[PDB]
Amino acid sequence: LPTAQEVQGLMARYIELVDVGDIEAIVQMYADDATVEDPFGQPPIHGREQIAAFFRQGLGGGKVRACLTGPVRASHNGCGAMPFRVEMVWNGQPCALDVILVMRFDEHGRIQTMQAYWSEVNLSV
Amino acid sequence: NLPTAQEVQGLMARYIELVDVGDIEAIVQMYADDATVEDPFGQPPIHGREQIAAFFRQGLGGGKVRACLTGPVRASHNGCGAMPFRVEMVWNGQPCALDVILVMRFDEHGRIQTMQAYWSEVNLSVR
C-alpha cells in the first residue's frame, strides 16, 4: 500500500507514460482486474485486456501530449488525484482537454480503480 | 433537477467563493440533509448536516482562511465535478499553503450529496 509520496511518484510517472505513448507500460501499471471509468459517468472498462484495447484505440497513432498542470494530491490510504491537460492537433487546429484523474492503488503498487472527470465543457480547441 | 455539467462548474466555483469570504452558513446550506463528507479522504466520513456544520465551525470558523481556484472545474454529465484549489492559512505557527482537490456529487435538487477532499502533508507548502 503506497505511501503519500509514493503515490505522487506513481501518478507523475503515469502522465509521463501517456505523454510518450508507451501503451504496454501503461497497462502494466494497472492491476490485472483494474477498473477504468473514463469519462466518469459511463460504464466502466474491466481487466487489462479491455484496458489495453481502450488505450490502443485512444493513444493509437494519435500522437498526443499530456502534462501535469498542478501537483498530485495524495492521501494516506493509497489514493490520489491530479489535474492535467491533454493536447492534440490532428485537424490543423490545436485542441486541449483539461482532466482530473482519481486513482486508488492496491497493496502491490498497482492501479485498482481509475476515474477521469471531464466533459465537453472542458474542451478548448 | 440533476445539474448539468455547466451548472456543476458554477455551483463548485461558488463553493470556493463562500469558503474564501467565510460564509460558514451559506456553505452548510449547500449540503443535503444526509450528505456525507470526507476531508481528508481516507478518514472516517461525517454524516448529516449537524456533524457537517459542526465540522466547518472548527475548521474555517477559527482562522482567517484564504482560498482560490487553481484551475477550471472538471464536470461529468451525471451530477459530479472535480476541482483543484489552494488554501492559505497559519499552520503550527507558520504561514502555509495547502493544495487540494475536491470531488463532489450533487443530488436531484442541486445540493451536495457527497464531498471528498484529497490532500496530505505532501501538499503542504511554506508561505
From Swiss-Prot, chain B:
Changing residue 126 to A: Slightly reduces activity and reduces protein stability. The active site is at 15 (proton donor), 39 (proton acceptor). Keywords: Isomerase, Lipid metabolism, Steroid metabolism. Changing residue 124 to A: Slightly reduces activity and reduces protein stability. The keyword Isomerase applies. It catalyses: a 3-oxo-Delta(5)-steroid = a 3-oxo-Delta(4)-steroid. It holds the Pfam family SnoaL_2. Its EC number is 5.3.3.1. Induction: By steroids. Substrate binds at residue 102. One of its GO terms (molecular function) is steroid Delta-isomerase activity. Changing residue 91 to A: Slightly reduces activity. Reduces protein stability. Homodimer. This is Steroid Delta-isomerase. It comes from Pseudomonas putida (Arthrobacter siderocapsulatus). The lineage of its organism: Bacteria, Pseudomonadati, Pseudomonadota, Gammaproteobacteria, Pseudomonadales. The gene is ksi.
